[PDB]
Every structure is written in C-alpha cells, then in structure tokens.
C-alpha cells in the first residue's frame, strides 16, 4: 500500500496518526471536510465532561470507544473522521487526540501555502510600515503562497528588527550589531 | 610603555561601547529600506 506524504512532516505518535489521516483524506479528496470536523471534534473532546471521561485509566477500552462512537456519530461524521477516532480509541491513544488535530492543522498550514513568519522589533509597529513590510517579505515567496504574520515586540533588542521567516532568518537588530562591534573591536 | 598602551586602549574600547548604549525611528524605516533592497 502506497502512502502520499505531506509536504511537512510531524513525528511521534501524533505525527504518525496525522500523516495517516492526511494520506487517508488525500485518497478521497476530503481534506477541508475532515480538517473542520477534526477541529470540531477536538472542541467536543475538550468540554469538561467527556474531556474528563476520556483520560480515566480504568474505563474499559471497549466501553470507552463505544461511548465515543455514540458521541461522535450524532454530529453527522464522515466515515474517515470516526474511523480515525475508533483507531485512536481501540489503540488507547485518546489523550493525544487534540495534539493530533493540532498537528493536522499545521499540515493544512502548509497545504494552503501558509508561511509563518515573525518580525520582532523593539516597540509595537503601526500598520502602514507593517503593510509595506508584508509587501517586502512577501516578495521573497515563490509562485502561489500565502503568508502568516506573527509579530512580537521586545525592547531587549533595543531597536532594529528580526525577520525569522520559516527557516530564513535575518538579524538587523542593533543588539547583534553592537555585539559585532564588541567582538570586532576587541579582535 | 607598551603595556600602558594596551591597558588604556582596552579600557577606552569598552567605555565607548558602554557609552553609546544610552543613544529615532529613522533606523527602522532604514531597515524596511534595507529589506526593500533584499530582493
């Protein structure tokens, strides 16, 4: 049986179940459907009642998975989502469910081309320069991508700006500049 | 004599650095300009 691998990989049992579902969905073209239903079942399994029942280490595996079937089948679940649910339950991997979902979300965060990038500066920024910066660091991208800006503010860098886009990373802050000064003048 | 040439050179090289630290958004706009010329 041949599996199609997602363009980004997650590991651990979380990543294994995540890529299992990615292959299972890309083989019937239900990516967005199972993604939204995964987020919703994650919200369901975190309400205190079932979120507290799922991790009780004595409730029998058969009875737990049957009750979980009862609970999920009412939301009109497509077969793939409840299949993954029963596969996690009969394997005792329920406390990890949300994590898997989280992982799966990140997988879609690469299928849509979402490149997460950070621009950290000393003080908060106004959105005119922020928008022209979105334009600037959007110029790097190739054909067909979307970008997610998550800017934070730290005065410890005393100014400048740090652009960590995916793996690329430019350090234009005054701090690394003055460290360069110290190390170069001392040597 | 040369030792004093070193002792004062090594002190004057740190003072000037611990002095500029107290010293304008012109740098940030320059960074976006530097980023504009990144290509």
């Amino acid at each position: 049986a041949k599996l199609v691998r997602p363009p980004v990989q997650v590991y651990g049992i979380e990543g294994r179940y995540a890529t299992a579902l990615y292959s299972a969905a890309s083989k019937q073209n239900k990516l967005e459907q199972v993604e939204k239903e995964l987020l919703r079942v994650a919200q369901i399994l975190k309400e205190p009642k079932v979120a507290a029942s799922v991790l009780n280490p004595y409730v029998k595996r058969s009875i737990k998975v049957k009750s979980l079937n009862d609970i999920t089948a009412k939301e009109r679940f497509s077969p793939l989502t409840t299949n993954l649910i029963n596969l996690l339950a009969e394997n005792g991997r329920l406390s990890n469910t949300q994590g898997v979902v989280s992982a799966f979300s990140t997988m879609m965060s690469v299928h849509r081309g979402e490149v997460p990038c950070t621009v950290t500066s000393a003080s908060p920024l106004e959105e005119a320069t922020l928008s022209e910066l979105k334009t600037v660091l959007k110029s790097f991208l190739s054909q067909g991508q979307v970008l997610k800006l998550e800017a934070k503010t730290d005065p410890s860098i005393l100014g400048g700006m740090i652009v960590r886009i995916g793996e690329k990373y430019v350090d234009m802050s005054v701090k690394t500049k003055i460290q360069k000064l110290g190390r170069a003048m001392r040597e | 004599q040369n030792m004093m040439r070193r002792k004062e050179q090594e002190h004057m090289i740190n003072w000037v650095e611990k002095h500029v630290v107290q010293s304008t958004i012109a740098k940030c706009i320059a960074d976006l300009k530097l980023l504009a010329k990144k290509a």
């Binding site: 005054v174 500049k177 000064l181 | 004057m12 003072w15 000037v16 650095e17 002095h19 500029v20 010293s23 740098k27």
Partner: peptide, 15 residues
Amino acid sequence: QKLFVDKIREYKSKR
C-alpha cells in the same frame, strides 16, 4: 548607519 556614526563620535570623544 548608526554603527558608523557611533564609531566616528566615539573616536572624536576619545581623542
């Protein structure tokens, strides 16, 4: 170039 003005000003201060 805050680095360069820093250098020149500290040179003028040390001199």
